[PDB]
Design a protein around this ligand. Structure first.
Ligand SMILES: *[C@@H]1O[C@H](CO)[C@@H](O[C@@H]2O[C@H](CO)[C@@H](O)[C@H](O)[C@H]2NC(C)=O)[C@H](O)[C@H]1NC(C)=O
Ligand SMILES: *[C@@H]1O[C@H](CO)[C@@H](O[C@@H]2O[C@H](CO)[C@@H](O)[C@H](O)[C@H]2NC(C)=O)[C@H](O)[C@H]1NC(C)=O
Ligand SMILES: *[C@@H]1O[C@H](CO)[C@@H](O)[C@H](O)[C@H]1NC(C)=O
Ligand SMILES: *[C@@H]1O[C@H](CO)[C@@H](O)[C@H](O)[C@H]1NC(C)=O
Ligand SMILES: *[C@@H]1O[C@H](CO)[C@@H](O)[C@H](O)[C@H]1NC(C)=O
Ligand SMILES: *[C@@H]1O[C@H](CO)[C@@H](O)[C@H](O)[C@H]1NC(C)=O
Ligand SMILES: *[C@@H]1O[C@H](CO)[C@@H](O)[C@H](O)[C@H]1NC(C)=O
Ligand SMILES: *[C@@H]1O[C@H](CO)[C@@H](O)[C@H](O)[C@H]1NC(C)=O
Lengths: 132, 127, 219, 48, 48
């Protein structure tokens, strides 16, 4: 085929800023300027397809956001355990999810833990019932 | 969704349920319905324990070649004496015959301990 | 999960056909929206089942539980991934079935990887072994495993001296049953048809859609 | 099917169930999840 | 006292700006878009 048709764009929201990131599903970093024919594309499209913020994921090649090491909860999915978010000057970062806090409880032959106080809590549940 | 909401009304609201996490998160106490556009909102009231402490415990208690098992509780000790408490809230009490029941002797159960079981009647029967 | 491309499928790299296609309107954007909704719903479906506890508990180091043996189901650290032996047999049996067609059709990857799912099931197993039901209602409260088993025996209506007097016999029966599960699953008549049919249905549907492109529809 | 699996995780695994035949065939004692491709496998320990 | 305080917090938390009622906004939005697209489709030549 001539050209790869569509890409995937990650935006924080035109409310917040105008930065983006682009995901090239199914291709690999080194040949991304090819198979998009980056040479004939206008500038401001050639800013992507190459650069210093180039990342490789199981889902594809991600250009426009850098890879921190620490972890947070998911904000915008990208696939294969990789999320992304807009956060501190101000930029777009991409990380790995954190499944949750870490804990380990003590098991012993003859020890038992017993509560000594209680709390009462109220929670909500929203359900639909009908449509137009 | 309509069928689920009808089930939640029948069980949550017009009764107290024991299905886990069906009717709120915790031990269920009651629920209250409200009305929304095209929908419904339940307010669940639950019970959540807090402020636990560690103790040391035993299966049974050997006494006179007999093994007492708790009736509705668990034996615990504060390092010196052995009580029996209910299970979700800490209330120590003196181990008596009204609290326990007896089955067999002390060679079969693993982890049995030694203590005394006070009898309510004998102190009344002074003579 | 899958995805589609209006133009690359309908009009094959033919710019006159692509120009003419604009007349029909919003049809294939409708198709795209439907498919995207399905794709998101799949990841939610996986999230609901497994992500039930925030707190990730860990296996105790000492492996004495009064005579109950769980090595079959607990994660095995020696093999590179933390997959229990039974999970290994399952991942070897189901997977008899990212393709050469790519006529506008892809297969997107899941959001949670199998390492993450294995971590979640390990957390639930560890919590359950150490504390009883308590960890799904509040904070984890440790309890000896035979005392927990006595609690459950009371639950089903048999007094609790019975467990303490037949502890060894009970442990042996439970270990033997866990052992036999491996072989029952290794039995050739696949009990895993339920999970094989999903891959079969999807592959066959995609093949039919692709093979439809070599048809003339009375032209 | 997914909603069913979530319900079984809540009732069968994080608790002890009184419904008949929901969690196995017998009287229910406990259960252990195990992961598998495109689904999950339960092991239902009961009384007979 | 715990009960009363909890109910007060419930009202405030619902009153929080973030969309907590999206499951009910979607039922509205879906119908709106369906009708809009159906009207839009009238302006297609369909090969004529
Ligand atoms: C159980 O927790 C409650 C709070 O939920 C404790 O009540 C507090 O007690 C302190 C000391 O008397 C007061 O200053 C607070 O105002 C109380 N809180 C409320 C909401 O009334 C209670 O003391 C705890 N139980 C025990 C045995 O300490
Ligand atoms: C729990 O069960 C496993 C599985 O039977 C035991 O592992 C066996 O250990 C014996 C003694 O080393 C070997 O002869 C078997 O070949 C082992 N089985 C496998 C599959 O490797 C394990 O020993 C048991 N737990 C304890 C504490 O003994
Ligand atoms: C952008 O969002 C903020 C808060 O979400 C809001 O105050 C602001 O009015 C929005 N921008 C416009 C142009 O409405
Ligand atoms: C991307 O391409 C280069 C060279 O074409 C290759 O060395 C590399 O392995 C490829 N990426 C992956 C993930 O295999
Ligand atoms: C419990 O007892 C067993 C055997 O008596 C022993 O292997 C284990 O270390 C003990 N655990 C603790 C915490 O004392
Ligand atoms: C008490 O329980 C806590 C659990 O948080 C544990 O860290 C501590 O070691 C225990 N102390 C004992 C058993 O003396
Ligand atoms: C244990 O409880 C008894 C009875 O209340 C008390 O006399 C004793 O001092 C307690 N022991 C400790 C170590 O607190
Ligand atoms: C309990 O008391 C009996 C009384 O004869 C004694 O034989 C046994 O050794 C005692 N056990 C412990 C653990 O003190």
């Amino acid at each position: 085929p001539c050209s790869f048709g569509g890409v995937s764009v990650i935006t924080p929201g035109t409310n917040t800023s105008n930065q983006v990131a682009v995901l090239y599903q199914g291709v690999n970093c080194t040949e991304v300027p090819v198979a998009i024919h980056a040479d004939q594309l206008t500038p401001t499209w050639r800013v992507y397809s190459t650069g210093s913020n180039v990342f490789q994921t199981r889902a594809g090649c991600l250009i426009g956001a850098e890879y921190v090491n620490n972890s947070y909860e998911c904000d915008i999915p990208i696939g294969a355990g990789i999320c992304a978010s807009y956060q501190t000057s101000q930029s777009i970062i991409a990380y790995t999810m954190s499944l949750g806090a870490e804990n380990s409880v003590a098991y012993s032959n003859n020890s038992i833990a017993i509560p000594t106080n209680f709390t009462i809590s109220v929670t909500t549940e929203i359900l639909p019932v009908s449509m137009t | 969704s309509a069928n689920l909401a009808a089930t939640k009304m029948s069980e949550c609201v017009l009764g107290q349920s024991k299905r886990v996490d069906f009717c709120g998160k915790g031990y269920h106490l009651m629920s209250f319905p409200q009305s929304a556009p095209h929908g419904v909102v339940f307010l669940h009231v639950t019970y959540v324990p807090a402020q636990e402490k560690n103790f040391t415990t035993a299966p049974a208690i050997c006494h006179d070649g007999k093994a007492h098992f708790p009736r509705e509780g668990v034996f615990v000790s504060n390092g010196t004496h052995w009580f029996v408490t209910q299970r979700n809230f800490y209330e120590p009490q003196i181990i008596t015959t009204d609290n326990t029941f007896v089955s067999g002797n002390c060679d079969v159960v693993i982890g049995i301990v030694n203590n005394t079981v006070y009898d309510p009647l004998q102190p009344e029967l002074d003579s | 999960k899958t995805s589609v491309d209006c133009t690359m499928y309908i009009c094959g790299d033919s710019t006159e056909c692509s120009n003419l296609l604009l007349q029909y309107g919003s049809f294939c954007t409708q198709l795209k929206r439907a498919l995207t909704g399905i794709a998101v719903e799949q990841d939610k479906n996986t999230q609901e089942v497994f992500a039930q506890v925030k707190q990730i508990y860990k296996t105790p180091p000492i492996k004495y539980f009064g005579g109950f043996n769980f090595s079959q189901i607990l994660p095995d650290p020696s093999k590179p991934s933390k997959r229990s032996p039974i999970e290994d047999l399952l991942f070897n049996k189901v997977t008899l079935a990212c393709a050469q067609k790519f006529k506008g059709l892809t297969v997107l990857p899941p959001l949670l990887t199998d390492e993450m799912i294995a971590q979640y099931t390990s957390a639930l197993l560890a919590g359950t072994i150490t504390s009883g039901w308590t960890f799904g209602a509040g904070p984890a409260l440790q309890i000896p495993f035979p005392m927990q088993m006595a609690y459950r025996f009371n639950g089903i209506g048999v007094t609790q001296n019975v467990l303490y007097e037949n502890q060894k016999l009970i442990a042996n029966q439970f270990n033997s049953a866990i052992g036999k599960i491996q072989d029952s699953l290794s039995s050739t008549p696949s009990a895993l048809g339920k999970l094989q049919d999903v891959v079969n249905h999807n592959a066959q549907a995609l093949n039919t859609l692709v093979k439809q492109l070599s048809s003339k529809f009375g032209a």
